[PDB]
Point group: none
Amino acid sequence: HLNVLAKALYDNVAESPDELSFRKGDIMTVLEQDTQGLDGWWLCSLHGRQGIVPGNRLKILVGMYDKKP
Amino acid sequence: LNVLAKALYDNVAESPDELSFRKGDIMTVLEQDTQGLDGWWLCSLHGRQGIVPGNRLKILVGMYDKKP
Ligand SMILES: [Mg+2]
């Protein structure tokens, strides 16, 4: 039904094309925590782009969700 | 000698004057408060010069750049 929303606590400059770049304050959808065997890397979607993100650079936006569509 | 400084944070540049960088990157500090700009430093990272907020960096004691 619902995906977690998370807010960036820090900037993130992608080190590879699989990683999202984002700025502090950006709000993204969490598609999968610890995606594809990674520990600490979350698959997220931000303004239509998808990539992995270090989970420890985010905070969960409590109570706020994005529909799985 | 020019000072070296380490990034404490990643930094997304939004204009070509600014450098983008990742936490842990080490850059050369060419000029602090460059052009009289409070807290903006002229730095070089991997051969690109731009301005960087000093408050994202940590000066590395005893470490200096000298161009080959
Ligand atoms: Mg990184």
